[PDB]
């Protein structure tokens, strides 16, 4: 019982693009760009589509960097998030009614205003490591248990 989601991090040598979600699931937190994968669409195609919808950016090749499964206690469906990175995009980040994008220097990533699990795996992403993670949440703020391991093949 898991649902497929994507997450895209535009990660350049000295900065990363995050977006402040304005409403819905995850509102009020900085994050990468992503969402549900649709019928008849590959995971990577869904990731590329979500980046365009939410940031206005066009990406060619995405690189698989991680998979994180999220459990929210009391909710039946696990969220199976496939995480991708790119350093090459086209277009300018656009603010919309749904999303406010902003570039961050790697030393100033706003972990206090992000999902709490990001503090665990984002540093692996910054050092170009790949990972498999599982996080059990109570509500949206409390990590009850987790696992996180580096891998060679996502």
Ligand X SMILES: OCc1csc(-c2ccnc3[nH]ccc23)n1
- Nearest Cα to 17, choosing from 34, 4, 5? 34
Q: Which residue is nearest to ligand X (CB)?
A: 115
Helix, coil or strand: residue 44: helix
Rounded to whole angstroms, the Cα distance separating 71 from 52 reads 27
- By DSSP bridging, strand 63-72 and strand 130-138 are parallel
Q: Contact between 45 and ligand X (CB under 6 A)?
A: no
**Residue 109 DSSP class:** -
Candidate residues 11, 115, 130, 131; the one interacting with ligand X per rule CB under 6 A: 115
Q: Are 7 and 99 in contact (CB under 8 A)?
A: no
Phi, psi dihedrals of residue 17, rounded to the nearest 5°: -90, 125
Torsion of CA 83, 70, 141, 14, to 10 degrees: -10
Q: Least distance to ligand X from the beta carbon of 80, Å?
A: 9
- Binding range to ligand X, per CB under 6 A, among 31-39, 40-48, 58-66, 144-152: 31-39
Q: Least distance to ligand X from the beta carbon of 122, Å?
A: 9
Q: Contact between 30 and ligand X (CB under 6 A)?
A: no
Rounded to whole angstroms, the Cα distance separating 30 from 118 reads 10
Q: Least distance to ligand X from the beta carbon of 66, Å?
A: 10
Candidate residues 49, 64, 117, 136; the one interacting with ligand X per rule CB under 6 A: 117
**Residues in 55-94 at the binding interface with ligand X, rule: CB under 6 A:** 70, 79, 81
Q: Least distance to ligand X from the beta carbon of 100, Å?
A: 16
Interacting residues with ligand X (CB under 6 A):
5, 7, 31, 34-35, 70, 79, 81, 115, 117-118
């Amino acid at each position: 019982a898991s649902r497929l989601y994507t997450l895209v991090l535009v990660l350049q040598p000295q900065r990363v693009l995050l977006g402040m979600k304005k409403r819905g699931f995850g509102a009020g937190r900085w994050n990468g760009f992503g969402g549900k994968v649709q019928e008849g669409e590959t995971i990577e195609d869904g990731a590329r589509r979500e980046l365009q919808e939410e940031s206005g950016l066009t990406v060619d090749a995405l690189h698989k960097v991680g998979q994180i499964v999220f459990e929210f206690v009391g909710e039946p469906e696990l969220m199976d998030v496939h995480v991708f990175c790119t350093d090459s995009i086209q277009g300018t980040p656009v603010e919309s009614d749904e999303m406010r994008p902003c570039w961050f220097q790697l030393d100033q990533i706003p972990f206090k205003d992000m999902w709490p699990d990001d503090s665990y795996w984002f540093p692996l992403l910054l050092q170009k490591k790949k990972f498999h993670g599982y996080f059990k949440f109570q509500g949206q703020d409390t990590i009850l248990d987790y696992t996180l391991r580096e891998v060679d093949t996502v």
